[PDB]
Amino acid sequence: SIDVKYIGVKSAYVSYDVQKRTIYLNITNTLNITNNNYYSVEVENITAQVQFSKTVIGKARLNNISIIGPLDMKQIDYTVPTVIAEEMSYMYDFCTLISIKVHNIVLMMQVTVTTTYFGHSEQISQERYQYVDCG
Amino acid sequence: SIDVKYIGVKSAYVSYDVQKRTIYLNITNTLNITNNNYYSVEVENITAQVQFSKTVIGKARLNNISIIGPLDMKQIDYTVPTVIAEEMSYMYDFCTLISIKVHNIVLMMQVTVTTTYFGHSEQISQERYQYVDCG
Amino acid sequence: SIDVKYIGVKSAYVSYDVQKRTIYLNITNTLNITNNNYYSVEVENITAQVQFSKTVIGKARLNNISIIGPLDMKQIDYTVPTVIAEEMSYMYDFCTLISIKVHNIVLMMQVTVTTTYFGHSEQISQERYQYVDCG
């Protein structure tokens, strides 16, 4: 919710970036920085009454007050059928980041069959870092 | 919730980056930094009443107040059928990060079949770091 | 929740990075840093009443108040059928990070069949670090 960032290279408060055939000569840098951060975040005052039946008095008849179902759920159920007579594959790979017929799956399930939940529920997913470097 | 970052290279408060045929000569750097962080975060005062029946008085009949189900759930259930007569693969790989017919799976399940939950629930997933480096 | 970071290379508060044919000569670096962090995080005050029946008075009849079921769950149930008459693989691999027909599975389950839960529940998954380095 606050300060969520994807940054391709670099993050700073003060940054000096001096490069590529440069003269940086006789310089006076003076910084008087005040940068206080005050966070009052997700401060919750919750008064909750949760009843299916609160009061029954006398010969009353109650049936099937809350029904959740039937429930039939399927997720990440794909199919990749391959029927081939003859394959030739020639692969020449030099200095390459390569993935071939790979299956990458992330499933995060947090509050899934609950009657009641009070408070804070959080999911964070930060995906893979992959690289190839050649001289 | 606060300060969630993906950063491709580097993170600083003060950064000096001086490089690649640079002269950095006779410099005065003076920094008076005040940077206090005050966090009052996910601060909860919760008063909760949770009843299926709070009060029953006299000859009352209560049946099936809360039904969850039947529940049928299936996850990460995919199919990869291969029928082949003949395969040739020639692979020549030099300085490669290479993945072939791999299955990578993460399942995180936190509060999954519950009547009641109070407080904080957190899932964090930070995926793989992989590289190839050649001179 | 606070300060969740994927950083590809380096993390610092003050960073000097001086490199690649650089002259760094006669410099006055003066730093007066105040950087106090105050955390009041996940401070919970919870008053909770959780009853299926709180009060029953007299000849009342209660049946099937809360039912969770039947429940059928299956996860990471994929299939990889292979039928081949003839295979040739030739693989030449030099300085390669290579994975072939591998199955990588991470399953984290925390609070999965509970009546009631009070407090903090945390799952953190930090995946594999792999590399190949060649001269």
Side-chain angles (χ1 to χ4, degrees):
Chain A
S1 199
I2 305 175
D3 193 22
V4 182
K5 312 284 172 62
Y6 206 118
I7 300 175
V9 186
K10 56 184 281 175
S11 185
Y13 191 85
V14 187
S15 177
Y16 295 89
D17 203 303
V18 189
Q19 63 177 1
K20 299 181 184 181
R21 298 189 178 271
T22 288
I23 308 302
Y24 188 97
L25 185 150
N26 297 345
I27 289 113
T28 297
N29 293 315
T30 300
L31 299 90
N32 186 53
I33 292 157
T34 311
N35 178 42
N36 292 350
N37 304 291
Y38 310 82
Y39 298 94
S40 181
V41 176
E42 296 151 38
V43 180
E44 293 174 2
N45 184 357
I46 296 164
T47 308
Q49 297 255 4
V50 185
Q51 294 102 16
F52 291 73
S53 311
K54 198 182 183 191
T55 298
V56 186
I57 293 158
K59 211 165 181 180
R61 190 176 293 239
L62 295 78
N63 184 73
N64 286 356
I65 293 175
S66 185
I67 309 296
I68 314 298
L71 184 143
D72 179 24
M73 190 177 291
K74 60 208 193 91
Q75 304 177 120
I76 313 183
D77 192 21
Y78 65 92
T79 311
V80 190
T82 295
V83 179
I84 301 167
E86 304 196 39
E87 287 193 348
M88 177 167 180
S89 53
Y90 176 98
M91 294 163 174
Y92 181 101
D93 303 334
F94 177 102
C95 293
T96 65
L97 171 45
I98 177 164
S99 178
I100 314 177
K101 295 189 292 184
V102 177
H103 303 266
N104 300 292
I105 293 156
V106 175
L107 197 170
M108 304 179 65
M109 79 186 296
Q110 199 163 49
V111 183
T112 72
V113 184
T114 186
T115 305
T116 316
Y117 186 107
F118 303 85
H120 184 47
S121 193
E122 171 177 290
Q123 297 183 309
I124 301 163
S125 181
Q126 298 184 312
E127 295 189 0
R128 62 191 181 274
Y129 191 101
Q130 302 177 298
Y131 68 90
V132 176
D133 187 342
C134 285
Chain B
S1 193
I2 307 173
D3 189 22
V4 181
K5 313 285 172 64
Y6 207 117
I7 301 176
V9 184
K10 58 186 281 175
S11 185
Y13 192 87
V14 188
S15 180
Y16 296 86
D17 206 303
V18 190
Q19 64 179 358
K20 297 182 184 181
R21 293 191 170 269
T22 288
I23 306 302
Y24 189 95
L25 187 150
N26 298 342
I27 292 115
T28 297
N29 294 314
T30 301
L31 298 92
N32 187 44
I33 293 159
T34 314
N35 177 39
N36 294 347
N37 304 293
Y38 307 84
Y39 298 96
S40 181
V41 177
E42 295 150 37
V43 181
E44 297 176 3
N45 179 348
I46 300 173
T47 309
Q49 298 262 1
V50 186
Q51 293 99 18
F52 291 77
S53 308
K54 198 185 182 196
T55 299
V56 187
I57 290 160
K59 209 160 179 177
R61 192 180 295 244
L62 296 77
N63 186 73
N64 287 356
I65 291 178
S66 182
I67 309 297
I68 315 301
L71 184 142
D72 181 21
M73 189 177 290
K74 58 205 195 91
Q75 302 182 125
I76 313 183
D77 195 13
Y78 64 94
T79 312
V80 191
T82 297
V83 175
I84 300 173
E86 308 199 38
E87 293 191 359
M88 174 165 175
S89 52
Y90 175 99
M91 293 160 174
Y92 181 103
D93 309 334
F94 185 103
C95 294
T96 66
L97 173 45
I98 177 163
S99 179
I100 311 177
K101 294 191 288 180
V102 178
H103 305 267
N104 300 292
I105 294 161
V106 175
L107 198 171
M108 305 177 65
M109 77 186 298
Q110 198 162 47
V111 183
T112 79
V113 187
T114 186
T115 307
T116 318
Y117 186 107
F118 303 85
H120 182 46
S121 193
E122 182 169 300
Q123 297 183 311
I124 300 160
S125 178
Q126 298 185 311
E127 293 188 0
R128 62 190 179 273
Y129 192 104
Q130 302 175 299
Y131 66 91
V132 176
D133 188 340
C134 285
Chain C
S1 192
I2 307 175
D3 184 24
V4 182
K5 310 289 172 66
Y6 208 118
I7 302 174
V9 184
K10 60 188 285 175
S11 186
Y13 190 85
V14 185
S15 182
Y16 296 89
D17 207 304
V18 190
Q19 62 179 1
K20 300 182 184 183
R21 291 188 174 269
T22 290
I23 303 302
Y24 188 98
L25 185 149
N26 298 344
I27 291 111
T28 296
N29 292 315
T30 301
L31 299 91
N32 182 56
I33 292 157
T34 311
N35 176 42
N36 293 349
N37 305 292
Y38 307 82
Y39 297 95
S40 183
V41 176
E42 298 153 27
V43 179
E44 295 173 2
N45 179 346
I46 301 172
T47 306
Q49 296 256 4
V50 186
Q51 293 100 17
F52 292 76
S53 311
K54 197 184 183 192
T55 298
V56 184
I57 292 158
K59 209 162 181 178
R61 191 178 293 239
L62 293 78
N63 186 76
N64 288 0
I65 293 175
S66 185
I67 306 295
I68 317 298
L71 183 143
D72 185 26
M73 190 176 291
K74 60 209 194 92
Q75 305 176 120
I76 313 182
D77 197 20
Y78 67 96
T79 312
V80 190
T82 296
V83 177
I84 303 167
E86 306 201 44
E87 288 190 348
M88 174 166 179
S89 53
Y90 176 96
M91 293 162 173
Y92 180 98
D93 308 339
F94 183 95
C95 294
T96 68
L97 172 45
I98 180 162
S99 181
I100 313 178
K101 295 189 293 182
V102 177
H103 303 266
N104 302 294
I105 291 155
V106 175
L107 199 172
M108 304 181 65
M109 77 186 298
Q110 198 160 48
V111 184
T112 71
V113 187
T114 189
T115 300
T116 311
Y117 186 104
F118 304 89
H120 178 45
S121 195
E122 189 154 285
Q123 296 183 309
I124 302 164
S125 179
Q126 297 183 310
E127 292 188 358
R128 65 190 182 273
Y129 192 105
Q130 299 177 300
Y131 66 90
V132 177
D133 184 341
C134 284

Short mmCIF file of all heavy atoms in Angstrom, two decimals, chain C residues 56-86:
data_model
loop_
_atom_site.label_atom_id
_atom_site.label_comp_id
_atom_site.label_asym_id
_atom_site.label_seq_id
_atom_site.Cartn_x
_atom_site.Cartn_y
_atom_site.Cartn_z
N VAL C 56 -28.16 -21.84 26.02
CA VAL C 56 -29.36 -22.65 25.79
C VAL C 56 -30.13 -22.81 27.10
O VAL C 56 -29.57 -23.30 28.09
CB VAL C 56 -29.02 -24.01 25.14
CG1 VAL C 56 -30.31 -24.77 24.83
CG2 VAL C 56 -28.26 -23.85 23.82
N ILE C 57 -31.39 -22.40 27.12
CA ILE C 57 -32.30 -22.48 28.28
C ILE C 57 -33.58 -23.22 27.87
O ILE C 57 -34.21 -22.85 26.89
CB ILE C 57 -32.59 -21.06 28.83
CG1 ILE C 57 -31.33 -20.44 29.46
CG2 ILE C 57 -33.74 -21.05 29.85
CD1 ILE C 57 -31.36 -18.91 29.54
N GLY C 58 -33.97 -24.23 28.64
CA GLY C 58 -35.19 -25.01 28.43
C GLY C 58 -35.02 -26.18 27.47
O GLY C 58 -33.90 -26.59 27.15
N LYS C 59 -36.14 -26.73 26.98
CA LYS C 59 -36.21 -27.91 26.10
C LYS C 59 -35.82 -27.67 24.63
O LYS C 59 -36.41 -28.25 23.72
CB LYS C 59 -37.58 -28.60 26.29
CG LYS C 59 -37.49 -30.11 26.02
CD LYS C 59 -38.68 -30.88 26.61
CE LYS C 59 -38.50 -32.37 26.33
NZ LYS C 59 -39.59 -33.18 26.92
N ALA C 60 -34.88 -26.78 24.37
CA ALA C 60 -34.40 -26.48 23.02
C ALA C 60 -33.71 -27.69 22.37
O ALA C 60 -33.06 -28.48 23.05
CB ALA C 60 -33.43 -25.31 23.11
N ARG C 61 -33.82 -27.82 21.05
CA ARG C 61 -33.08 -28.82 20.26
C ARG C 61 -32.17 -28.15 19.24
O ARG C 61 -32.63 -27.43 18.36
CB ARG C 61 -34.08 -29.81 19.65
CG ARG C 61 -33.37 -31.03 19.05
CD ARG C 61 -34.35 -32.06 18.48
NE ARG C 61 -35.17 -32.70 19.53
CZ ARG C 61 -35.24 -33.99 19.82
NH1 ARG C 61 -34.49 -34.89 19.25
NH2 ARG C 61 -36.09 -34.42 20.70
N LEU C 62 -30.87 -28.40 19.36
CA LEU C 62 -29.83 -27.92 18.45
C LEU C 62 -29.14 -29.11 17.79
O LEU C 62 -28.69 -30.03 18.47
CB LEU C 62 -28.81 -27.01 19.17
CG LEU C 62 -29.33 -25.66 19.69
CD1 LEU C 62 -30.12 -25.72 20.99
CD2 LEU C 62 -28.15 -24.73 19.94
N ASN C 63 -29.07 -29.10 16.47
CA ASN C 63 -28.37 -30.12 15.69
C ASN C 63 -27.63 -29.48 14.51
O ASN C 63 -28.08 -28.47 13.98
CB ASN C 63 -29.42 -31.15 15.26
CG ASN C 63 -28.78 -32.33 14.57
OD1 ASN C 63 -28.18 -33.19 15.20
ND2 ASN C 63 -28.84 -32.39 13.26
N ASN C 64 -26.52 -30.07 14.04
CA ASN C 64 -25.73 -29.60 12.89
C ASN C 64 -25.50 -28.07 12.91
O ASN C 64 -25.83 -27.38 11.95
CB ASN C 64 -26.40 -30.07 11.57
CG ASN C 64 -26.28 -31.54 11.25
OD1 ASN C 64 -25.70 -32.32 11.99
ND2 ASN C 64 -26.86 -31.92 10.12
N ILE C 65 -24.98 -27.52 14.01
CA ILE C 65 -24.75 -26.07 14.12
C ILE C 65 -23.73 -25.63 13.07
O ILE C 65 -24.04 -24.76 12.27
CB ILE C 65 -24.34 -25.65 15.54
CG1 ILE C 65 -25.52 -25.87 16.51
CG2 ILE C 65 -23.89 -24.17 15.58
CD1 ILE C 65 -25.15 -25.58 17.96
N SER C 66 -22.54 -26.22 13.06
CA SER C 66 -21.50 -25.94 12.07
C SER C 66 -20.94 -27.22 11.45
O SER C 66 -20.41 -28.06 12.17
CB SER C 66 -20.39 -25.10 12.70
OG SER C 66 -19.44 -24.72 11.73
N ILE C 67 -21.06 -27.36 10.14
CA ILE C 67 -20.50 -28.48 9.36
C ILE C 67 -19.52 -27.93 8.34
O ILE C 67 -19.89 -27.11 7.50
CB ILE C 67 -21.62 -29.30 8.67
CG1 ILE C 67 -22.72 -29.82 9.62
CG2 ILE C 67 -21.02 -30.44 7.84
CD1 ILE C 67 -22.25 -30.84 10.66
N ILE C 68 -18.28 -28.42 8.35
CA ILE C 68 -17.28 -28.17 7.31
C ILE C 68 -17.01 -29.52 6.63
O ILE C 68 -16.17 -30.29 7.10
CB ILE C 68 -16.00 -27.51 7.86
CG1 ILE C 68 -16.22 -26.36 8.87
CG2 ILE C 68 -15.15 -27.02 6.68
CD1 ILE C 68 -16.99 -25.15 8.35
N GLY C 69 -17.76 -29.86 5.59
CA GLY C 69 -17.48 -31.05 4.80
C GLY C 69 -18.63 -31.61 3.97
O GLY C 69 -19.73 -31.05 3.98
N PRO C 70 -18.40 -32.73 3.27
CA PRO C 70 -17.10 -33.35 3.09
C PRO C 70 -16.16 -32.45 2.28
O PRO C 70 -16.59 -31.62 1.48
CB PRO C 70 -17.36 -34.66 2.36
CG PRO C 70 -18.61 -34.35 1.55
CD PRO C 70 -19.40 -33.45 2.50
N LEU C 71 -14.86 -32.57 2.52
CA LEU C 71 -13.83 -31.80 1.84
C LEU C 71 -12.86 -32.74 1.14
O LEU C 71 -12.25 -33.60 1.78
CB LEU C 71 -13.15 -30.87 2.86
CG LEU C 71 -12.08 -29.96 2.23
CD1 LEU C 71 -12.11 -28.58 2.88
CD2 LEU C 71 -10.67 -30.52 2.39
N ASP C 72 -12.71 -32.59 -0.17
CA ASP C 72 -11.72 -33.31 -0.96
C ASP C 72 -10.77 -32.28 -1.59
O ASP C 72 -11.19 -31.41 -2.34
CB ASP C 72 -12.39 -34.19 -2.03
CG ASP C 72 -11.36 -35.04 -2.79
OD1 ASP C 72 -10.28 -35.33 -2.23
OD2 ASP C 72 -11.65 -35.47 -3.94
N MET C 73 -9.49 -32.36 -1.24
CA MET C 73 -8.48 -31.43 -1.73
C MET C 73 -7.28 -32.21 -2.27
O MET C 73 -6.77 -33.11 -1.60
CB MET C 73 -8.12 -30.43 -0.62
CG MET C 73 -7.25 -29.28 -1.14
SD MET C 73 -6.88 -28.00 0.09
CE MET C 73 -8.50 -27.21 0.34
N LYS C 74 -6.82 -31.86 -3.47
CA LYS C 74 -5.55 -32.36 -4.01
C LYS C 74 -4.75 -31.27 -4.70
O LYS C 74 -5.29 -30.45 -5.44
CB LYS C 74 -5.74 -33.68 -4.77
CG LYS C 74 -6.68 -33.63 -5.98
CD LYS C 74 -7.31 -35.03 -6.15
CE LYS C 74 -8.00 -35.21 -7.50
NZ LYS C 74 -7.08 -35.80 -8.51
N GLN C 75 -3.46 -31.24 -4.44
CA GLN C 75 -2.55 -30.20 -4.90
C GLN C 75 -1.27 -30.78 -5.49
O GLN C 75 -0.73 -31.73 -4.93
CB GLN C 75 -2.22 -29.31 -3.69
CG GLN C 75 -3.45 -28.73 -2.97
CD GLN C 75 -3.09 -27.93 -1.72
OE1 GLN C 75 -3.37 -26.75 -1.61
NE2 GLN C 75 -2.46 -28.53 -0.74
N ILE C 76 -0.75 -30.20 -6.58
CA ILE C 76 0.50 -30.63 -7.24
C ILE C 76 0.31 -32.10 -7.66
O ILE C 76 0.93 -33.04 -7.16
CB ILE C 76 1.73 -30.35 -6.34
CG1 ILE C 76 1.70 -28.92 -5.76
CG2 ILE C 76 3.01 -30.58 -7.16
CD1 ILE C 76 2.92 -28.56 -4.91
N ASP C 77 -0.61 -32.27 -8.60
CA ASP C 77 -1.13 -33.54 -9.09
C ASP C 77 -0.97 -33.69 -10.61
O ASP C 77 -1.68 -34.46 -11.26
CB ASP C 77 -2.60 -33.56 -8.64
CG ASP C 77 -3.26 -34.94 -8.67
OD1 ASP C 77 -2.55 -35.97 -8.67
OD2 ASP C 77 -4.50 -34.98 -8.63
N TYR C 78 -0.05 -32.92 -11.19
CA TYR C 78 0.21 -32.90 -12.62
C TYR C 78 0.72 -34.25 -13.14
O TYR C 78 1.19 -35.10 -12.38
CB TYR C 78 1.17 -31.75 -12.95
CG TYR C 78 2.57 -31.89 -12.40
CD1 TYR C 78 3.60 -32.41 -13.22
CD2 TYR C 78 2.87 -31.43 -11.11
CE1 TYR C 78 4.91 -32.48 -12.73
CE2 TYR C 78 4.18 -31.53 -10.62
CZ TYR C 78 5.20 -32.05 -11.43
OH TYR C 78 6.46 -32.11 -10.93
N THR C 79 0.63 -34.48 -14.45
CA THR C 79 1.05 -35.72 -15.11
C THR C 79 1.94 -35.41 -16.32
O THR C 79 1.64 -34.50 -17.09
CB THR C 79 -0.18 -36.55 -15.53
OG1 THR C 79 -1.13 -36.66 -14.49
CG2 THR C 79 0.14 -37.99 -15.90
N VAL C 80 3.02 -36.16 -16.54
CA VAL C 80 3.94 -35.97 -17.68
C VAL C 80 4.15 -37.32 -18.41
O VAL C 80 5.22 -37.92 -18.30
CB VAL C 80 5.27 -35.31 -17.23
CG1 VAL C 80 6.14 -34.87 -18.41
CG2 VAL C 80 5.04 -34.08 -16.36
N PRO C 81 3.15 -37.86 -19.12
CA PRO C 81 3.28 -39.14 -19.83
C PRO C 81 4.22 -39.05 -21.03
O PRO C 81 4.07 -38.15 -21.86
CB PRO C 81 1.87 -39.53 -20.29
CG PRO C 81 0.95 -38.61 -19.51
CD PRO C 81 1.79 -37.37 -19.27
N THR C 82 5.18 -39.96 -21.17
CA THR C 82 6.10 -40.01 -22.32
C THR C 82 6.15 -41.39 -22.97
O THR C 82 6.52 -42.38 -22.33
CB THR C 82 7.51 -39.56 -21.93
OG1 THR C 82 7.49 -38.21 -21.54
CG2 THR C 82 8.50 -39.67 -23.09
N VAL C 83 5.80 -41.46 -24.25
CA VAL C 83 5.87 -42.66 -25.10
C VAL C 83 6.76 -42.31 -26.28
O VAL C 83 6.41 -41.45 -27.07
CB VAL C 83 4.48 -43.08 -25.59
CG1 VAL C 83 4.55 -44.29 -26.52
CG2 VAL C 83 3.57 -43.45 -24.41
N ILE C 84 7.92 -42.96 -26.42
CA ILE C 84 8.85 -42.70 -27.52
C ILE C 84 9.38 -44.02 -28.07
O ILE C 84 9.74 -44.90 -27.29
CB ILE C 84 10.01 -41.77 -27.08
CG1 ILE C 84 9.49 -40.43 -26.53
CG2 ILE C 84 10.98 -41.55 -28.25
CD1 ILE C 84 10.54 -39.61 -25.80
N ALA C 85 9.45 -44.19 -29.39
CA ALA C 85 10.01 -45.42 -29.95
C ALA C 85 11.55 -45.35 -29.85
O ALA C 85 12.16 -46.18 -29.20
CB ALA C 85 9.47 -45.72 -31.35
N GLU C 86 12.17 -44.34 -30.47
CA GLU C 86 13.62 -44.14 -30.47
C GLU C 86 14.03 -42.70 -30.10
O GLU C 86 13.55 -41.74 -30.69
CB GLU C 86 14.23 -44.55 -31.82
CG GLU C 86 13.85 -45.98 -32.25
CD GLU C 86 14.81 -46.60 -33.28
OE1 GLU C 86 16.05 -46.48 -33.13
OE2 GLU C 86 14.34 -47.28 -34.23
#
